[PDB]
């Protein structure tokens, strides 16, 4: 028991900087980061669906939540990455 995002953060770390490592304290920081952004996106998506009297959160709510939450350029790319993963997911 007691799951965390460490493994995944690390894999991503090796993709962008194979040569670089990360300390425990820094890893704790990244974990807080992921949990925080996760709660903000889900929280907003939660409100969006309720405002529109829908009972299910689809990628569409996640997308608008992202546009509302991330500033300009971060939103564009996040949105790009997002629709890209749903496409590659559906196909095969």
């Amino acid at each position: 028991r007691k799951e965390s995002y460490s493994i995944y953060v690390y894999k991503v770390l090796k993709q962008v900087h194979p040569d670089t490592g990360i300390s425990s304290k820094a890893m704790g920081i990244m974990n807080s980061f992921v949990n925080d952004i996760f709660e903000r996106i889900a929280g907003e998506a939660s409100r969006l669906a309720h405002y529109n009297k829908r009972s299910t959160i689809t990628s569409r709510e996640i997308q608008t939540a992202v546009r509302l939450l991330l500033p300009g350029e971060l939103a564009k790319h996040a949105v790009s990455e997002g629709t890209k993963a749903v496409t590659k997911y559906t196909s095969a």
Binding site: E44, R47, L48, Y51, N52, R60, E61, T64, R67, L68
Partner: protein, 84 residues
Amino acid sequence: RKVLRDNIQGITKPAIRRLARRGGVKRISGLIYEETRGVLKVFLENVIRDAVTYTEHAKRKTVTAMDVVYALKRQGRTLYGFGG
């Protein structure tokens, strides 16, 4: 319809003076008026931007008072009186 331009200047010197009065201001420097317009515009873009985002998400063409109320809540400017 008809091109909308320079409407920010619709926020007049006397209307800004009044707002400053309600805010307790006695004396106003000549450059305050353009600063205030700049600040209002930023305030309005951010709220209108979110309000319209809630509108498009509902697939509507009409921005509702609720769209604005939710945008205000997000921006940390909760508004009472239009929750219908």
